């Protein structure tokens, strides 16, 4: 009776009480249980009629199903989407997540589990305060809901309520003796979440609740997180707590000024200068107990300026934006230790802004520093390399000679990132294997664009030697796209995508120079993908054999003269002449096909299926497999 169950589920979802009563009319107890309780699949969601009625907030449907049909309020199903595949949630959890007070009241009166636990230990009170309704939270609390119940990451209801900008629910939770010193998975408390959320009222309620400030698992105070969030008012209220001593408050002021120095939406010279002036005055005022900051040695990526120790040094650079940005970056990475998550992103934004107006080299060195920091942080940088190859593509399009040591260092960063993605996809399971493979393919394509722009530049002998050495390293790493495409297959394939930015103007595939450089660096010319096509089957299907015949002929001769087997047979018994679809490529390859008795004998052996196992040299066995 799946059709009747589906009809009842649809009636409950749409709220049609008349249809639900008509479909439930004259039904036995077994039929009632089957129609009310069955899990139905719709829109990627597994839900029962009562669950789907509570999710849509149908009070009439819930009261009709619970007053007479006495359906048990312990149904299981999958609720919501967009990162929430929570299973086992009852109707109360759906009603609390969608902010429906009447449904929660009806379920509680009928006997729903107030302290129900889902798969990730999600209390319905947590969803109720997640939505932002005070009445539901109050009703659940008065109906014996345990706030202290948390998930596997130890996120209490106070934290999930403090993520959003709802003052009333967090205030009521604080009034109900919520623990403020609860620790999340990475040593985090609700104070960090309130600080990053930028709500002054939640932070002041927490500090009036004696939040017991403590650093996170990474090692930053919640005041530091508030400073990183470019929230001036959040930072300028904890000075009255009388527990930050003097070093913590001055370092928070410096961090807030640093965050003011570079932000996509919170960038302003005057406020940053004022805050840095306040920090400098507060640091240099006492004198006897002056707090001396430990200045790092000058990083070449951090310009040639080593901090601003003198007050007049800061006063004189008030009219320069770049020095302010540099000192903000230096103090930010000094306070955060240059190992935090949100260190590199302001550097990348500052580089992008610096590059938007034809200024290149300082952008390049800041991006290098950000790449180094993210590599030390074990963070993928596919987007960084992509935008950076875009920047060089724009440079080459504007006939600007790109500095070559930058290309060397960026290529070494690219091969390091590709190796990191390689062992990542080696260790990452099926949970995010698709995303890991997509990042891997993006890294491969970015390296190809970098090789193309390197071939479009002119460098020295030793510089070209180092670049080819790095390409040799990556070739010996032997990358493999999800379709088995080696490094050589992509360089000759016209199906390799190029992003919509200026890379289309320069990095156009197939490229003769890229393939020649790969073959000079010992690329596996006879490499076979999982499809079966070699590096020669892929090119000969090129659909533009005449307009750019030069970059087809050059790649064909470069492949053939190095190691290519012209007669190599793929998994579908297709010679490269067979997979040509072009007279130009077919006869151009035929001009390179040196006929050999070995190939004819291999074809004759394969065609009639002679058992060649152990009766020929082993190198001939794979040679027969070639044909």
């Amino acid at each position: 009776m799946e059709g009747l169950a589906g009809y009842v589920y649809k009636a409950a979802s749409e709220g049609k009480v008349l249809t639900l009563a008509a479909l439930l009319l004259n039904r036995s107890e077994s039929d009632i249980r089957y129609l009310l309780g069955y899990v139905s699949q719709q829109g990627g969601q597994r839900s029962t009629p009562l669950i789907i009625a509570a999710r849509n907030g149908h009070a009439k449907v819930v009261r009709l199903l619970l007053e007479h049909y006495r359906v048990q309020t312990q149904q299981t199903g999958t609720v919501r989407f967009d990162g929430y595949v929570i299973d086992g949630a009852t109707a109360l959890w759906c009603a609390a997540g969608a902010g429906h007070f009447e449904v929660v009241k009806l379920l509680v009166s009928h006997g729903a589990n107030v302290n129900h636990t889902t798969v990730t230990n999600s209390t319905p009170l947590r969803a109720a305060c997640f939505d932002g309704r005070l009445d539901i939270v109050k009703y659940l609390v008065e109906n014996n809901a345990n706030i202290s119940i948390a998930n596997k990451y130890d996120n209490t209801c106070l934290m999930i309520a403090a993520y959003k900008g709802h003052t009333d629910v967090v205030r009521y939770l604080l009034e109900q003796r919520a623990d403020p010193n609860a620790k999340a998975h990475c040593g985090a408390t609700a104070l960090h979440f309130a600080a990053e959320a930028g709500h002054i009222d939640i932070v002041k309620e927490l500090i009036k609740w004696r939040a017991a400030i403590v650093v996170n698992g990474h090692g930053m105070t919640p005041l530091k997180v508030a400073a990183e969030s470019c929230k001036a008012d959040v930072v300028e209220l904890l000075l009255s707590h009388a527990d930050c001593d003097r070093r913590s408050r001055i370092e928070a002021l410096e961090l807030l000024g640093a965050s003011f120095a570079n932000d996509r939406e919170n960038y302003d010279i005057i406020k940053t200068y004022h805050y840095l002036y306040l920090a400098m005055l507060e640091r240099f005022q006492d004198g006897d107990n002056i707090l001396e900051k430990e200045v790092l040695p000058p990083i070449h990526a951090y310009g040639n300026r080593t901090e601003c120790r003198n007050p007049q040094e800061l006063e004189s650079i008030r009219q320069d934006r770049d020095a302010l940005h540099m000192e903000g970056l230096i103090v930010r990475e000094r306070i955060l230790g240059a190992d935090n998550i949100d260190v590199s992103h302001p550097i990348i934004y500052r580089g992008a802004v610096y590059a938007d107006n034809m200024e290149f080299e300082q952008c390049i060195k800041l991006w290098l520093h950000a790449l180094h920091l993210r590599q030390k942080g074990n963070r993928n940088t596919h987007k960084d390399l992509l935008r950076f190859a875009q920047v060089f593509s724009q440079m080459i399009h504007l006939n600007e000679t790109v500095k070559a040591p930058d290309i060397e260092c960026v290529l070494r960063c690219s091969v390091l990132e590709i190796e990191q993605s390689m062992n990542r996809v080696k260790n990452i399971s099926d949970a995010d294997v698709h995303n890991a493979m997509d990042n891997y393919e993006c890294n491969l394509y970015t390296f190809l664009y970098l090789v193309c722009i390197s071939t479009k530049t002119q460098c020295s002998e030793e510089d070209q030697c180092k670049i080819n050495k790095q390409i040799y390293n990556l070739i010996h790493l032997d990358p493999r796209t999800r379709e088995g495409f080696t490094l050589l297959h992509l360089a000759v394939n016209s199906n390799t995508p190029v992003d919509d930015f200026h890379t289309n103007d320069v990095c156009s595939f197939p490229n003769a120079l890229v393939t020649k450089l790969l073959l000079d660096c010992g690329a596996e010319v006879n490499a076979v993908d999982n499809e079966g096509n070699s590096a020669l089957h892929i090119i000969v299907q090129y659909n533009r054999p005449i307009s750019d015949f030069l970059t087809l002929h050059s790649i064909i001769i470069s492949l053939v003269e190095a190691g290519a087997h012209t007669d190599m047979t793929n998994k579908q018994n297709k010679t490269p002449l067979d997979k040509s679809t072009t007279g130009v490529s077919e006869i151009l390859l035929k001009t390179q096909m040196k006929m050999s008795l070995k190939c004819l004998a291999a074809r004759a052996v394969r065609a009639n299926d002679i058992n060649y196992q152990d009766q020929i040299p082993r190198t001939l066995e794979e040679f027969v497999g070639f044909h």
Partner: peptide, 7 residues
């Protein structure tokens, strides 16, 4: 423009 697509 590099600022627009930074996201």
């Amino acid at each position: 423009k590099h600022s627009l697509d930074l996201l």
